Amino acid sequence: RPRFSFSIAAREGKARTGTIEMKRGVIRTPAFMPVGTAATVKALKPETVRATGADIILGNTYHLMLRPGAERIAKLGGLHSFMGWDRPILTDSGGYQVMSLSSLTKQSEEGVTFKSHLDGSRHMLSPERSIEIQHLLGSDIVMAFDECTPYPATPSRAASSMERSMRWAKRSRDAFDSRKEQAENAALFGIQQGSVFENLRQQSADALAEIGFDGYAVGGLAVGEGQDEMFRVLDFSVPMLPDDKPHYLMGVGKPDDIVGAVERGIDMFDCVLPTRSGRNGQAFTWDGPINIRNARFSEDLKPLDSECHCAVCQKWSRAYIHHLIRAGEILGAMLMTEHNIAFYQQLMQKIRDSISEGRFSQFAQDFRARYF
Amino acid sequence: RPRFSFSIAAREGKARTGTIEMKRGVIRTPAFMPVGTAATVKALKPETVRATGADIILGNTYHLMLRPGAERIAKLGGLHSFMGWDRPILTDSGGYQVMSLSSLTKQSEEGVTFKSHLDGSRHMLSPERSIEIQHLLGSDIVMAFDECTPYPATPSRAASSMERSMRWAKRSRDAFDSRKEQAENAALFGIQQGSVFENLRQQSADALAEIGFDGYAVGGLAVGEGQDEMFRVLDFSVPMLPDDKPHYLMGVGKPDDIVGAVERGIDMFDCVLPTRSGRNGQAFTWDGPINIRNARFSEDLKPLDSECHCAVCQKWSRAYIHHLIRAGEILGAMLMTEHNIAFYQQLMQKIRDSISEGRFSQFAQDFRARYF
Ligand SMILES: Nc1ccc2c(=O)[nH][nH]c(=O)c2c1
Ligand SMILES: Nc1ccc2c(=O)[nH][nH]c(=O)c2c1
Ligand SMILES: [Zn+2]
Ligand SMILES: [Zn+2]
Numbered sequence: 084r085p086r087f088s089f090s091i092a093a094r095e096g097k098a099r100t101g102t103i104e105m106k107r108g109v110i111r112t113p114a115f116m117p118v119g120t121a122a123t124v125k126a127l128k129p130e131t132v133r134a135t136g137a138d139i140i141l142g143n144t145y146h147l148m149l150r151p152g153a154e155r156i157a158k159l160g161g162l163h164s165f166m167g168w169d170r171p172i173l174t175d176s177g178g179y180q181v182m183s184l185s186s187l188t189k190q191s192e193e194g195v196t197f198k199s200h201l202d203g204s205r206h207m208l209s210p211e212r213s214i215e216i217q218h219l220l221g222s223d224i225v226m227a228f229d230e231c232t233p234y235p236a237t238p239s240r241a242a243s244s245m246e247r248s249m250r251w252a253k254r255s256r257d258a259f260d261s262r263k264e265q266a267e268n269a270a271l272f273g274i275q276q277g278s279v280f281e282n283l284r285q286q287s288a289d290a291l292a293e294i295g296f297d298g299y300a301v302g303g304l305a306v307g308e309g310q311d312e313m314f315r316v317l318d319f320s321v322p323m324l325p326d327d328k329p330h331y332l333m334g335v336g337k338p339d340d341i342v343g344a345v346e347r348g349i350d351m352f353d354c355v356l357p358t359r360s361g362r363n364g365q366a367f368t369w370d371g372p373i374n375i376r377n378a379r380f381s382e383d384l385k386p387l388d389s390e391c392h393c394a395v396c397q398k399w400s401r402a403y404i405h406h407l408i409r410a411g412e413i414l415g416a417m418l419m420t421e422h423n424i425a426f427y428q429q430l431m432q433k434i435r436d437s438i439s440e441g442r443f444s445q446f447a448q449d450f451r452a453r454y455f
Numbered sequence: 456r457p458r459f460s461f462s463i464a465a466r467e468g469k470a471r472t473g474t475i476e477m478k479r480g481v482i483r484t485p486a487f488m489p490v491g492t493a494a495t496v497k498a499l500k501p502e503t504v505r506a507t508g509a510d511i512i513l514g515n516t517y518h519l520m521l522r523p524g525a526e527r528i529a530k531l532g533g534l535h536s537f538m539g540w541d542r543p544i545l546t547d548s549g550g551y552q553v554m555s556l557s558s559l560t561k562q563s564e565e566g567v568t569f570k571s572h573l574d575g576s577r578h579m580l581s582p583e584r585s586i587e588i589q590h591l592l593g594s595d596i597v598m599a600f601d602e603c604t605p606y607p608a609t610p611s612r613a614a615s616s617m618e619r620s621m622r623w624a625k626r627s628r629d630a631f632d633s634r635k636e637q638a639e640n641a642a643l644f645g646i647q648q649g650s651v652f653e654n655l656r657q658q659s660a661d662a663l664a665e666i667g668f669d670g671y672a673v674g675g676l677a678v679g680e681g682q683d684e685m686f687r688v689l690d691f692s693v694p695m696l697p698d699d700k701p702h703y704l705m706g707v708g709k710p711d712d713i714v715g716a717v718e719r720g721i722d723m724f725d726c727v728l729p730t731r732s733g734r735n736g737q738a739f740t741w742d743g744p745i746n747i748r749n750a751r752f753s754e755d756l757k758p759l760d761s762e763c764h765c766a767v768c769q770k771w772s773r774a775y776i777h778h779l780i781r782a783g784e785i786l787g788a789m790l791m792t793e794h795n796i797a798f799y800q801q802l803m804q805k806i807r808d809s810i811s812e813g814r815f816s817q818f819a820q821d822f823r824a825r826y827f
Contacts, residue, residue: 122778126785151753151778159754159774167770361785381523382531398539402531406494406523413498413733413785 084109087270087297089329093439097321097348100438103329105223106268107163108138108170112329113345113434115336115427116141116173116353121150122166125358126417127424129168135393135421136428139170139223141353144177144216145184148206149199153219161221173224173272173353175333176213176255179231192247194228210254218265225265226300227255229274234306241278248276248302249290256294272298272331275324279308279316288323299324300331301349305340314343321348338367338430339454342447345434357423361416364408367426371454375419380405393425456481459642459669461701465811469693469720472810475701477595478640479535480510480542484701485717485806487708487799488513488545488725493522494538497730498789499796501540507765507793508800511542511595513725516549516588517556520578521571525591533593545596545644545725547705548585548627551603564619566600582626590637597637598672599627601646606678613650620648620674621662628666644670644703647696651680651688660695671696672703673721677712686715693720710739710802711826714819717806729795733788736780739798743826747791752777765797 084104089112091101103110117124117132120143124132132140142162147153151165159165162172178195182188185197194209213228229248232241252273259271273296277283291299301320304313313335321330329350335341336354344352360366364376368388373380375387386396387404395404395418407415437446456476461484463473475482489496489504492515496504504512514534519525523537531537534544550567554560557569566581585600601620604613624645631643645668649655663671673692676685685707693702701722707713708726716724732738736748740760745752747759758768759776767776767790779787809818 121782121784122775123784123786126789128786128789150782155754159756159772165772165775167775382527384531400531400537403494403537403539410493410522412493412495413788414495414500416785417498417500417789 086268089298089327091327093441095438095441095443096346098345098434098438098443099348099350100435101350105171105270107172107223110138110171111431111435112350113341113431113438114138114351115341115431116351117424117427118143118353118355118358119166119168119172120355120358121146122156122162124420124424126361126413126420127358129166131421132168132424133170135425136432137170137424140168140172142172142174142220142222143180144174144213144220145180147220148177148208148216149201149204153216157219157221163221171223172221173351174217174220174222174226176226176228177208177216178213178228181208182231190230192250210251211258214255214258214262214265218262218269222269224270224272224298225255225259227252227271227273227296229276229302231306232276232278232303234278234303234308236278238280238283241276241280241283245276245278245283245287248274249287252291252296253294256296270297272296272300272329274300274302274333275320276303277320278303279312281319284316284320285323288320292325296328298329298331298351300333300351302333304332305334310337310340310343313340314347317344317347317349336427338427339451341430342434342450345438346443346447357427358420360419360423361408364405364419365423366404366419367423369450369453375401375405375408377405387422388426391422391426391429393422393429395419395422395425458640461670461699463699465813467810467813467815468718470717470806470810470815471720471722472807473722477543477642479544479595482510482543483803483807484722485713485803485810486510486723487713487803488723489796489799490515490725490727490730491538491540491544492727492730493518494528494534496792496796498733498785498792499730501538503793504540504796505542507797508804509542509796512540512544514544514546514592514594515552516546516585516592517552519592520549520580520588521573521576525588529591529593535593543595544593545723546589546592546594546598548598548600549580549588550585550600553580554603562602564622582623583630586627586630586634586637590634590641594641596642596644596670597627597631599624599643599645599668601648601674603678604648604650604675606650606675606680608650610652610655613648613652613655617648617650617655617659620646621659624663624668625666628668642669644668644672644701646672646674646705647692648675649692650675651684653691656688656692657695660692664697668700670701670703670723672705672723674705676704677706682709682712682715685712686719689716689719689721708799710799711823713802714806714822717810718815718819729799730792732791732795733780736777736791737795738776738791739795741822741825747773747777747780749777759794760798763794763798763801765794765801767791767794767797
């Protein structure tokens with residue numbers, strides 16, 4: 084296969100369905116990427132992740148650079164070899180989780196200095212260091228290092244962050260290109276910023292296209308603005324990005340958010356919702372989510388979802404999973420996560436098929452009627 | 456298959472190898488039974504438990520009678536259906552864990568009254584109630600309700616406990632026999648008591664054989680007496696039990712304890728050591744156990760054990776599992792437990808084959824030389 088090749092097979096409105104071909108595999112779009120936090124997709128062996136339908140997973144860079152170390156993972160053979168996932172891996176830049184999880188962060192034009200929320204150590208994450216870490220991890224899809232703008236953001240602050248992000252995108256591009264092995268085997272995605280402001284989003288899209296990337300992510304969303312606002316921004320933001328390249332909406336994963344985002348031109352998604360199960364007990368169904376811990380499920384012999392074809396819904400009842408979760412058992416987390424990620428992959432499949440068959444709009448309508 | 460049929464295929468000294476045929480399946484002996492605590496073998500799907508080589512698992516009654524309830528499990532279709540394990544299940548009586556884990560236990564000739572260490576509720580576990588609960592769970596091998604004697608024990612206290620246990624064994628037998636469905640589909644094992652005293656052990660064995668059971672467990676051991684003492688007691692205790700019925704050593708599982716116990720006539724074992732992994736990081740190897748959390752394993756690419764054929768040792772390195780455990784990841788627990796239970800099943804296989812081939816004594820010798 085080629086280093087990178089995105090081809091759109093079908094369209095309906097702003098929605099697209101196709102494939103991204105990479106050396107390690109084919110990614111069917113619209114795609115949902117399960118999240119591997121500390122070199123692991125929570126409570127699932129990689130074979131189980133693949134069994135659910137996933138073509139690619141997202142690897143958190145922040146956690147990896149701290150815990151085992153990027154250099155260590157490289158010495159061990161890379162992330163794929165390390166965790167046992169031989170298919171594509173998109174890695175974030177680590178900056179977003181640095182601002183959210185690290186201590187005493189100091190920002191500058193060079194990058195971000197911070198203290199680990201673990202051992203209290205120090206790091207200087209810059210566009211160059213971020214690209215290098217993703218290379219050491221052996222990432223297939225590398226994210227440019229940017230600065231996510233907090234919500235709400237004033238026009239001047241959103242402008243300053245976006246402009247810095249564009250300068251960092253140029254540095255990320257150059258860093259990526261100077262490393263021959265990485266430039267020839269991996270892909271680089273740029274990230275659009277600009278908060279909820281159209282003119283800033285336009286300036287960002289233009290700067291990104293001018294630099295040129297293999298894919299374009301819509302950043303700065305799913306940070307507290309709400310669905311109506313998120314959709315409004317995507318309405319004018321997605322059309323600004325190059326049409327022939329993948330559109331990635333970072334950190335967006337509620338089933339309805341995904342459907343609405345695909346209707347607006349998004350090709351890629353990632354979220355912790357599926358994997359962050361095992362505790363609160365939320366299980367997705369076509370009739371909306373349910374909390375398995377609720378007493379009404381104690382003697383419910385039916386599967387998590389009546390039509391889901393995952394191994395969990397074939398073998399275990401709501402009553403059993405209810406028991407496991409309330410007992411704090413590891414298997415409860417394993418079962419809930421497998422079903423949840425399976426449900427998401429089934430949702431992406433239904434989206435891909437409906438687009439290919441010119442009935443996506445009808446699918447979105449029917450999906451919402453039932454889900455809500 | 457029959458309700459119960461134990462046949463010895465080969466012998467070497469006191470050691471025996473054979474099979475126990477039951478309606479739900481065949482159990483190869485000597486056998487190791489993984490422990491399912493709250494209707495689950497810690498961090499493993501039942502198919503994974505079977506994949507390791509297990510023919511039967513042990514189900515804790517104490518936890519089940521409290522958490523989901525025996526009556527509830529019966530309404531849901533039984534434990535097998537509930538947890539997804541369709542093979543034999545040996546259930547303990549619940550008494551041992553009542554004394555170890557419950558609050559304000561009050562003992563009497565009728566049974567034991569206690570408070571749940573969960574909701575602070577109350578129960579009156581008696582021989583009759585214990586047998587009934589195991590029936591409601593749909594147990595294949597039912598353990599008679601007894602009174603484990605604390606170590607150390609004075610002759611008079613050991614005598615009083617053993618005598619009460621024998622009276623309770625008679626009540627367990629009668630209770631089992633009066634329930635037609637249970638008497639026709641399940642088996643009943645009696646438990647020998649008597650602490651470290653030979654005369655008491657002899658009195659216990661005689662009372663048990665007089666009542667008549669499908670199997671005989673050696674109780675009152677692995678309670679703080681040490682290996683030398685345990686072996687000394689087994690030396691004279693096992694020969695007292697009927698030779699043509701299985702000999703079950705309860706709560707014994709260290710690899711060397713198992714080998715020594717088989718040399719003394721034991722056919723069945725169970726222990727939490729394999730399943731209780733995922734935290735401290737102990738992994739069994741043919742070169743003795745290792746603690747994967749140790750820094751020396753951070754960059755060790757070799758599998759947990761060089762010859763173990765489990766899926767974990769085929770796919771992941773010590774370095775990866777080291778990382779997972781230290782990161783507190785669920786997958787670390789899943790991987791460690793699968794390997795550990797797989798290692799135990801491989802040990803039982805080596806024991807079964809060496810006995811069948813008349814070279815068990817040599818195997819025990821070679822096993823210890825390397826393990827220690
Ligand atoms: N919701 C998210 C999630 C992740 C990211 C990111 O990694 N970079 N930049 C972003 O804007 C962003 C937004
Ligand atoms: N080590 C163990 C473990 C369990 C038991 C038991 O369940 N009954 N009786 C016993 O003596 C006993 C000893
Ligand atoms: Zn399912
Ligand atoms: Zn192994």
